[PDB]
Amino acid sequence: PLRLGHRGAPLKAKENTLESFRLALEAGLDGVELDVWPTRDGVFAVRHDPDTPLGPVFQVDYADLKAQEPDLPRLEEVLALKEAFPQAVFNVELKSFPGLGEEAARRLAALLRGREGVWVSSFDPLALLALRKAAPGLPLGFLMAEDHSALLPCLGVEAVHPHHALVTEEAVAGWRKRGLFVVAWTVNEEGEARRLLALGLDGLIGDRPEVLLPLGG
Template sequence: MPTPNRRAPRADGRPLVLGHRGASADAPENTLAAFRLALAQGADGVELDVWRCRTGEVVVVHDEDTGRVAGARFRVDATPLAELRALDVGAWKGERFRGARISTLPEVLEALPGAVVNVELKSRGRDLRLAEAVARDVRRAGAGGRVIASSFDYRLVAAFRLAAPEVPVGLLFEPGHRWRLRTALAARLLGAAAVHPDASLVTPARAEAWRARGLAVNAWTVDAPDEVARLTGLGAAALITNVPGRTRAQVRALTGR
């Protein structure tokens, strides 16, 4: 079995603030505009979603098809990069974002030097080559020290773990049947550095237990001020938020950092 990963990215004395798909309350999600705005608002980094398109590139988009953000429905894993590039994924969020395009993971890593990047691996089936492609892109960018890879599909986490043992991994989960046993086993077997729970699952007892096992607690999606305060008090390592500017300001007020 793999040896445990190195520590997940952290900040001293406060949780990291990561823009959920960038500053997605204000800009079109998973675009360079949203990522740059998140950093301009004070975020430590971003959370983003990746698929492998038909021509093999790792592209940054959340849904399995482009209908919601582009108005035209193309299945991401069945569409070549050139056709995905032709889509406008910004106009739905406002005229000022018209012309925003789908980016590749290497482009985002290059555009955000020094930023923490949580890469969520997504796949319709068992596309383990996605994990290998992400590992390649992170390594070529020299970004291993600021990336954490996560997924709800622990097969993808395992594949990434083998492809890039030097990069930490996190386990995503939400309320549902048997998440406790499934996640506990996967954390041990995969040498996870972090758990990425839905914020509602982070109780004082669970937060303490996860931290006692050396796991960073990276909670999502944390927008409400009372949740920011609660999770900061529980020692969360990262808050993944749609409103990074407001969340970062509140964390600074709560911690002095």
């Protein structure tokens, strides 16, 4: 299964920073998950929190956020790591300012046109619908904090990204019936990691590379 670094390797370097992503890949992980929010000027800032010292991300220009936060990456810079790690995959989680999700989705779709080794996930069903319409060939995943599997038949997604607590033998059987790729999060314990892999999951997103590395055989 895919061993993915949550925001890179968050315990080795600050989460969602270029250094973190690089360290996660140097550790031997198959890829990384990264959080993005659109800035006022349409740049996808790589960070988890939508609130900044200058206000919400969508109300601030990237250059201003960068002056305030010098280590704040923009999406293209993280994806550029594929040059050093050609086999690495990137899971971009598009974070919606619900109601602003569709517009952000259309902007992200255009940016990722024809890009390989990347798939986008989101907790926002509306953003996923917009993404699929704007970029039919872009792989997508539906993030779920609670079991909202009922929406899967209406979403154009190749994967489901359930919180690990939602992963049970019966839930997995349901996702398999639909031929979905299952990636759990956020797995930082060996015990839980082995419970999930025993169920046949296709990927795990976690904060500790050491826990994920030995998984898969």
